Amino acid sequence: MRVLVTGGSGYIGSHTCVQLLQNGHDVIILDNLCNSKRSVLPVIERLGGKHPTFVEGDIRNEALMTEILHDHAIDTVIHFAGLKAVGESVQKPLEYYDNNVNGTLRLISAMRAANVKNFIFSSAATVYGDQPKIPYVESFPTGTPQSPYGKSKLMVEQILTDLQKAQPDWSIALLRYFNPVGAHPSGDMGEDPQGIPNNLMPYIAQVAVGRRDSLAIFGNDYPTEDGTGVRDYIHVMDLADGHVVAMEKLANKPGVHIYNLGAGVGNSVLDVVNAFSKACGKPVNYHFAPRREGDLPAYWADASKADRELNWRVTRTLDEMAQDTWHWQSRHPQGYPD
Amino acid sequence: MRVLVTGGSGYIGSHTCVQLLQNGHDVIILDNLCNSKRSVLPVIERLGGKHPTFVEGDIRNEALMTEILHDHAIDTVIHFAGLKAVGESVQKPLEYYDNNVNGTLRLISAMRAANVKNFIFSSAATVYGDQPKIPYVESFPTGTPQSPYGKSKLMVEQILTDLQKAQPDWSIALLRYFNPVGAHPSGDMGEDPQGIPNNLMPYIAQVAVGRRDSLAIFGNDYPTEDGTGVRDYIHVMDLADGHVVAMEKLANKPGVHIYNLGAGVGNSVLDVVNAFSKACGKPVNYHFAPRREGDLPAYWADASKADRELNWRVTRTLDEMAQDTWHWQSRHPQGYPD
Ligand SMILES: NC(=O)c1ccc[n+]([C@@H]2O[C@H](COP(=O)([O-])OP(=O)(O)OC[C@H]3O[C@@H](n4cnc5c(N)ncnc54)[C@H](O)[C@@H]3O)[C@@H](O)[C@H]2O)c1
Ligand SMILES: NC(=O)c1ccc[n+]([C@@H]2O[C@H](COP(=O)([O-])OP(=O)(O)OC[C@H]3O[C@@H](n4cnc5c(N)ncnc54)[C@H](O)[C@@H]3O)[C@@H](O)[C@H]2O)c1
Ligand SMILES: O=c1ccn([C@@H]2O[C@H](COP(=O)(O)OP(=O)(O)O)[C@@H](O)[C@H]2O)c(=O)[nH]1
Ligand SMILES: O=c1ccn([C@@H]2O[C@H](COP(=O)(O)OP(=O)(O)O)[C@@H](O)[C@H]2O)c(=O)[nH]1
Ligand code: NA
Ligand code: NA
Numbered sequence: 001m002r003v004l005v006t007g008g009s010g011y012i013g014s015h016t017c018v019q020l021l022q023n024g025h026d027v028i029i030l031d032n033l034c035n036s037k038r039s040v041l042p043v044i045e046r047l048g049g050k051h052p053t054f055v056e057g058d059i060r061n062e063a064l065m066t067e068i069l070h071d072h073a074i075d076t077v078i079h080f081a082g083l084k085a086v087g088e089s090v091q092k093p094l095e096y097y098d099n100n101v102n103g104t105l106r107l108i109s110a111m112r113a114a115n116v117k118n119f120i121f122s123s124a125a126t127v128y129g130d131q132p133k134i135p136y137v138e139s140f141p142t143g144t145p146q147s148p149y150g151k152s153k154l155m156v157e158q159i160l161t162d163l164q165k166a167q168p169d170w171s172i173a174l175l176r177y178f179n180p181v182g183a184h185p186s187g188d189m190g191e192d193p194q195g196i197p198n199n200l201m202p203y204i205a206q207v208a209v210g211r212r213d214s215l216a217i218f219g220n221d222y223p224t225e226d227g228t229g230v231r232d233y234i235h236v237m238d239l240a241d242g243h244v245v246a247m248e249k250l251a252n253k254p255g256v257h258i259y260n261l262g263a264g265v266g267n268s269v270l271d272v273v274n275a276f277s278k279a280c281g282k283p284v285n286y287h288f289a290p291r292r293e294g295d296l297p298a299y300w301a302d303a304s305k306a307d308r309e310l311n312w313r314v315t316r317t318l319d320e321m322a323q324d325t326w327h328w329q330s331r332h333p334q335g336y337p338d
Numbered sequence: 339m340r341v342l343v344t345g346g347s348g349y350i351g352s353h354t355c356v357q358l359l360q361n362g363h364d365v366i367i368l369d370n371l372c373n374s375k376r377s378v379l380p381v382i383e384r385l386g387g388k389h390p391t392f393v394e395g396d397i398r399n400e401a402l403m404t405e406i407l408h409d410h411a412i413d414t415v416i417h418f419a420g421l422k423a424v425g426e427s428v429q430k431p432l433e434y435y436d437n438n439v440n441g442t443l444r445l446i447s448a449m450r451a452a453n454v455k456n457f458i459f460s461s462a463a464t465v466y467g468d469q470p471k472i473p474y475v476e477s478f479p480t481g482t483p484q485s486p487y488g489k490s491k492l493m494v495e496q497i498l499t500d501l502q503k504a505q506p507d508w509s510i511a512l513l514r515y516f517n518p519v520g521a522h523p524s525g526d527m528g529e530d531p532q533g534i535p536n537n538l539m540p541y542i543a544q545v546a547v548g549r550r551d552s553l554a555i556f557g558n559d560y561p562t563e564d565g566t567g568v569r570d571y572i573h574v575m576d577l578a579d580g581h582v583v584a585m586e587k588l589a590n591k592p593g594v595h596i597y598n599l600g601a602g603v604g605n606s607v608l609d610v611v612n613a614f615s616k617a618c619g620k621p622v623n624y625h626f627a628p629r630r631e632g633d634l635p636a637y638w639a640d641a642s643k644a645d646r647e648l649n650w651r652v653t654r655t656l657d658e659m660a661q662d663t664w665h666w667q668s669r670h671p672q673g674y675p676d
């Protein structure tokens with residue numbers, strides 16, 4: 001298929017592009033480079049085994065999106081582009097609403113204009129809001145996300161749903177990601193956050209690499225087995241694979257196809273820390289800190305639906321997530337070259 | 339004060355501009371004319387007793403908004419501009435999200451750029467969603483609006499709330515309108531819908547004027563006194579006045595000030611029909627039809643808060659709403675001149 005992968009040079013998108021190319025699809029990457037570098041492009045091609053076309057540009061530029069769509073006879077679009085720092089979204093709400101809400105709106109508007117009707121959207125577990133019922137199931141009604149970031153995701157899901165109702169021939173997949181971690185097994189592609197990493201894994205990796213002192217564990221008094229927060233970590237390669245399958249199996253299948261993408265099990269901060277120490281050969285330094293504002297104690301995905309409907313399920317383990325992350329971090333301590 | 343009134347040439351905005359000018363404020367009207375005509379401008383000035391400046395343009399044009407803001411040293415913005423046909427929003431969701439969600443986002447982004455921090459937003463009762471608890475109170479948590487239109491309003495309220503949190507010096511009023519009806523007492527300014535009117539009052543007026551055959555009453559089996567739908571009708575002049583007061587009393591008062599703007603009492607479709615027949619001197623023709631998709635049986639506003647906090651309450655009656663509407667309709671059967 002001919003697929004436009006917005007945000008394709010970023011963390012999840014890069015790994016997805018590799019898998020797509022390996023499945024022999026024709027890949028057009030669209031990215032504005034606000035959170036990634038052109039240096040990953042060659043890695044993508046080398047690992048994917050085929051050349052993906054790259055276009056530097058912004059999802060907010062509807063005219064350009066329209067042109068790309070038509071120019072490359074795209075059949076389906078995989079929407080990863082956007083801003084995702086939670087804390088920052090609280091501080092700079094407008095930029096989140098613009099890049100995520102308007103960003104998507106301009107993109108799907110461009111699609112309408114070019115007669116493209118197959119879409120995959122990067123959504124998140126945050127859409128569930130404060131849900132006491134875990135694991136989270138697609139059938140659950142959504143709640144109220146606590147941050148501008150979370151809200152922007154849910155708003156897009158709603159807009160996409162209304163669009164589909166209005167243009168019933170569209171196929172739209174709402175992929176709710178849990179906690180993406182890991183890196184390509186080669187160790188030459190992985191997450192390359194700039195500055196202080198907001199997520200657990202990359203932070204741990206930086207402590208392990210010798211860049212940071214200690215991992216601050218946000219809260220140790222939660223109603224969990226070990227008192228630390230529990231989440232559903234999912235390896236980026238498994239996420240990538242789920243994206244190829246969703247794209248191939250849902251194209252031209254009208255509807256709004258919602259799927260949680262997670263392993264279906266929970267792991268605590270300590271469990272993650274422990275796996276990492278194991279992977280890197282030395283105890284990871286850490287300390288307990290107060291609970292992070294807005295955090296839930298525990299949640300994980302109910303991934304039965306994707307298993308059933310798409311025959312997709314995770315295959316990488318927590319140890320692999322940790323080992324792959326350390327391999328990339330250690331092989332490329334400065335991330336992607338400038 | 340120096341106020342930019344977006345959508346100022348439309349129904350509610352036109353009447354608001356008149357009241358503003360009567361209070362001697364300097365008024366800049368911004369409208370794209372998609373649902374109003376330049377012909378109302380002179381009426382505004384004549385009834386307002388002062389000249390308002392008019393700029394033809396779109397809220398989506400952030401550069402222009404920014405320029406207007408700075409150029410006119412605006413102190414406060416009253417945001418009426420947007421699309422509001424419910425049924426149509428279901429059919430053309432994107433246009434609603436664009437004009438309302440993006441439209442507002444571009445406008446407040448322009449404000450940020452120009453250092454403007456006083457805003458009034460035209461919100462609606464739809465934000466309450468399916469609320470069994472009536473009357474509706476500002477303290478109630480919001481629900482899930484059933485149409486793209488309703489959703490777009492709630493999304494804006496959320497964006498505005500996050501913005502205020504991020505920029506705590508801002509004063510933002512969320513004015514939730516109930517069922518605006520009526521016309522300026524002169525009979526020379528009023529609602530001028532194009533095509534089939536979606537709201538009850540204008541439809542009734544058109545039946546009364548001899549343009550339409552019969553009023554279709556959507557449903558006669560509701561759990562209400564007379565079986566027809568019950569709402570809180572509020573005269574446009576009262577709404578207008580509430581806007582002047584909100585603007586004058588909340589400017590430079592940091593916070594998100596939410597107020598329901600309604601009369602605080604309910605009236606049925608039949609009650610409205612009856613008042614109109616009374617006003618126009620002849621029985622209004624009507625028939626019973628099936629319930630309109632998504633309609634609630636009954637709802638009205640709890641307007642205590644605005645009374646208490648702003649010392650504002652309605653002063654026009656249902657009969658006046660009907661008489662003023664008929665006077666305008668009858669004096670100007672073709673609406674505003676082309
Ligand atoms: N990483 C996670 O834990 C997590 C969890 C759920 C959802 N998501 C979502 O998945 C998607 C991908 O996440 P990621 O981890 O790969 O992040 P990422 O930052 O690595 O990738 C996003 C990419 O989008 C690009 N981009 C940002 N705004 C753009 C715009 N306006 N126009 C064009 N390009 C733009 C960035 O340059 C970057 O390459 C995002 O939508 C994110 O919100 C991620
Ligand atoms: N009339 C009601 O019953 C009702 C109830 C609640 C909320 N509202 C809201 O109150 C506001 C005013 O409603 P109204 O009855 O006066 O409607 P209206 O159509 O008469 O006024 C809206 C005005 O905005 C202008 N406009 C539309 N999109 C624009 C854009 N992108 N850029 C610039 N101008 C644009 C139109 O030309 C029109 O003059 C709207 O936001 C509406 O959703 C109205
Ligand atoms: O420096 C960090 C980052 C994360 N966490 C915890 O690790 C889990 C995952 O946090 P993350 O930000 O990666 O993702 P989230 O679950 O919030 O989407 C949660 O229980 C966080 O409290 C932590 O203790 N320290
Ligand atoms: O042609 C019409 C228009 C409206 N209504 C009813 O009148 C009330 C007000 O409808 P409207 O569309 O004006 O406003 P809403 O309350 O839906 O915001 C509701 O009970 C509608 O069902 C009706 O019976 N016929
Ligand atoms: Na096509
Ligand atoms: Na339709």
Ligand code: NA
Nearest residue numbers: 193194195196
């Ligand atoms: Na960063």
Ligand code: NA
Nearest residue numbers: 334335336337
């Ligand atoms: Na680097």
Ligand code: NA
Nearest residue numbers: 452453454455
């Ligand atoms: Na100012």
Ligand code: NA
Nearest residue numbers: 090091503504
């Ligand atoms: Na802040």
Ligand code: NA
Nearest residue numbers: 531532533534
């Ligand atoms: Na119309």
Ligand code: NA
Nearest residue numbers: 672673674675
């Ligand atoms: Na006319």
